[PDB]
Ligand SMILES: *[C@@H]1O[C@H](CO)[C@@H](O[C@@H]2O[C@H](CO)[C@@H](O[C@@H]3O[C@H](CO[C@H]4O[C@H](CO)[C@@H](O)[C@H](O[C@H]5O[C@H](CO)[C@@H](O)[C@H](O)[C@@H]5O[C@H]5O[C@H](CO)[C@@H](O)[C@H](O)[C@@H]5O)[C@@H]4O)[C@@H](O)[C@H](O[C@H]4O[C@H](CO)[C@@H](O)[C@H](O)[C@@H]4O[C@H]4O[C@H](CO)[C@@H](O)[C@H](O)[C@@H]4O)[C@@H]3O)[C@H](O)[C@H]2NC(C)=O)[C@H](O)[C@H]1NC(C)=O
Ligand SMILES: CNC(=O)CN1Cc2ccccc2C[C@H](NC(=O)CCc2ccc(Cl)cc2Cl)C1=O
Ligand SMILES: [Ca+2]
Ligand code: NA
């Protein structure tokens with residue numbers, strides 16, 4: 030119940046929300062059908078429209094008008110945004126030359142530059158260039174401020190997950206808004222685009238920017254706008270709030286536009302109908318900037334122009350139907366569209382089986398336009414698994430396509446031509462970032478970055494301490510003129526042991542064999558130097574990774590590679606080696622095919638054994654440092670040490686051997702040498718974070734050798750490829766991957782073919798940031814470079830996407 034008989038007199042767009050049944054006058058009362066009876070008359074005035082005209086100038090104030098052109102309107106803070114232009118001979122902001130804002134220029138009583146977030150739904154990144162001729166105000170923000178060529182949204186590339194990511198810095202699996210539609214099995218409740226469940230605070234986790242601000246004594250405008258409040262009124266309300274007295278005035282504000290998404294869905298991303306909504310957004314920016322100029326705030330306020338996701342061409346004829354795959358289609362519930370999520374239709378149906386569903390959806394039709402995954406097998410870069418609202422079975426849908434359950438869903442719910450939601454590396458999903466203001470840099474282009482980084486920067490812009498989030502604070506300091514956040518590198522928690530030769534060959538009973546008993550003061554001192562680390566500077570180029578948790582491990586040196594060997598997990602946490610452009614690939618010699626060699630530095634009790642592999646019929650082994658890239662026949666024996674061995678399913682060894690035998694050398698060729706750090710990942714609870722020992726669900730049969738869920742590699746070179754990776758004076762270049770360690774190659778439908786036709790494609794799908802690897806391993810990389818620390822943070826957040834040009 031709302032007793033709508035109260036009044037909005039002097040309450041229009043009030044910032045405090047009054048509680049039921051008292052009637053509301055805030056910018057959301059419409060969405061709750063709770064506004065006071067006179068809210069439209071008083072708060073949504075439209076008379077005479079939104080623009081001053083010559084004959085209105087100096088008019089007698091008429092309080093009924095939507096906005097004013099009377100002499101008192103500046104002091105009342107309610108002029109039409111074009112008032113000084115029409116009536117006082119001023120220029121529109123867009124018409125003024127851009128001039129650097131070196132310091133804030135704020136009216137007295139302003140304690141800090143306010144922040145205004147101008148949020149545009151479905152604003153595809155390439156609109157900034159492709160629509161530039163019809164967006165002069167936005168083009169001026171972009172060219173005169175700080176801009177990225179695109180900003181990467183989070184997956185799924187849907188509105189609710191992305192806006193709530195922008196406000197919290199959190200992945201949707203963490204904040205809990207994992208789609209536009211959701212079922213929470215603990216609540217037994219459904220969240221929908223339409224209806225009243227979505228306003229229940231229990232859905233929304235983390236701490237959004239307006240809560241962070243309020244807790245720290247920084248007042249906030251309301252961030253949400255009812256769809257029926259016209260955009261001109263939204264702008265006027267913000268400008269009115271900015272004329273509040275100092276003690277009452279917010280420091281952070283948000284505007285929202287439902288366009289261009291609304292039209293993009295109807296017309297496609299580049300339909301001829303799309304020019305007009307771009308013109309209209311630009312005009313609204315122009316209103317804001319003109320309004321700020323009138324208040325003498327246009328060189329005081331920081332403005333962020335930001336989108337949530339892009340828009341792709343999708344039509345209802347490009348829909349895949351589960352009813353062409355599944356016998357039991359009526360036994361499942363599908364969340365459909367540009368992603369699929371499947372769960373049992375009834376929890377009382379004991380004939381539901383996710384394995385038979387996955388199998389029936391796997392590589393069934395030659396051109397099939399979606400791929401099924403258990404959520405733990407999705408690319409780790411999507412960070413889309415650790416939430417009970419994310420169904421176990423996921424369909425990744427190809428760009429331009431939909432998935433639906435049955436054809437009747439699509440015609441008896443087709444006119445739509447655009448949609449979004451796909452993989453967040455897809456070019457059509459990328460969106461926009463521009464920042465303009467005293468705190469942002471001047472005429473500066475920054476590389477693309479992820480929207481999970483923005484909350485930290487928004488906190489910086491406002492002097493707030495951010496709540497714990499998934500950004501890497503400092504990774505965007507290069508966007509900022511001032512207020513940068515200068516972090517210190519985390520302290521190493523575990524120091525390594527440096528074991529020398531401690532065990533005789535006969536102390537080992539590992540069941541391994543090697544034909545190496547084939548036999549010099551020249552060469553012997555040399556090989557002792559290698560075991561003491563004399564080649565370490567060439568293979569460990571950026572310092573040893575720091576271990577940020579408590580464990581026991583050994584540094585092992587070799588001619589060709591250095592490793593940090595875990596006594597707890599019986600294998601390296603990391604293996605680091607450098608391959609120059611001149612390196613030669615060689616075979617594993619016939620007599621060495623099955624060679625594994627005890628490591629006389631490491632006790633038998635902390636070693637793997639070969640018998641466990643012989644006896645585990647499902648599990649084989651591979652090596653982290655590749656025997657194919659040994660520097661000499663003699664150095665090659667080091668690659669067969671038991672301390673360089675890792676457990677690998679035979680199907681996985683196909684991928685790994687092709688990476689090591691072919692792809693490493695290709696990258697060294699293309700990049701002028703590469704440094705590679707490889708290792709295992711254990712993430713059996715799919716939380717994106719390093720497992721402890723007691724979370725490991727699988728061991729090599731009969732043994733304490735834990736099976737990795739993934740293997741990573743970090744592949745670093747000189748950004749200026751005219752210098753070789755090992756003599757790089759400047760910024761670095763990196764690509765990394767986190768490959769799932771799976772017992773089949775069912776993910777790759779072309780896997781019966783030669784590895785040259787599918788392996789690299791798999792690796793590209795599983796591209797990752799170095800930061801993703803850090804979370805998964807508790808290691809901290811790039812500890813010793815000549816680069817600034819924030820530069821390194823940027824490098825660690827880089828994702829190599831392999832998409833063509835935006
Ligand atoms: C991205 O950034 C985020 C933010 O930094 C990272 O997320 C954090 O990760 C931490 C570790 O996983 C985690 O810390 C835990 O906090 C628990 C207390 O939980 C509440 O309090 C916090 C703080 O206010 C709050 O934010 C939480 O919010 C979660 O849950 C609510 C309601 O369910 C949601 O609305 C909200 O969206 C959020 O859900 C997300 O996180 C939870 C995990 O908490 C997931 O379950 C969800 O699916 C979703 O992703 C909570 O309201 C605390 O209880 C934990 O402590 C346990 O473990 C430690 C080990 O150190 C130990 O001290 C205790 O023994 C304890 O164990 C006991 O409970 C076990 C489980 O029942 C049981 O098995 C044992 O036997 C014990 O009884 C833990 O310290 C922190 O909560 C989140 N924060 C957020 C916002 O997500 C994220 O990791 C980053 N991602 C990457 C990849 O880097
Ligand atoms: C009832 N009416 C609406 O909700 C309209 N609406 C759309 C919407 C839909 C789902 C989730 C959030 C929002 C928020 C959107 N506001 C904005 O984007 C302005 C900036 C902003 C605000 C909030 C958040 Cl969480 C993040 C950001 Cl960057 C807004 O007002
Ligand atoms: Ca884990
Ligand atoms: Na085996």
Ligand code: NA
Pocket residue numbers: 774775776777778779780781
């Ligand atoms: Na296959």
Ligand SMILES: [Zn+2]
Pocket residue numbers: 151188290291294449
């Ligand atoms: Zn949309």
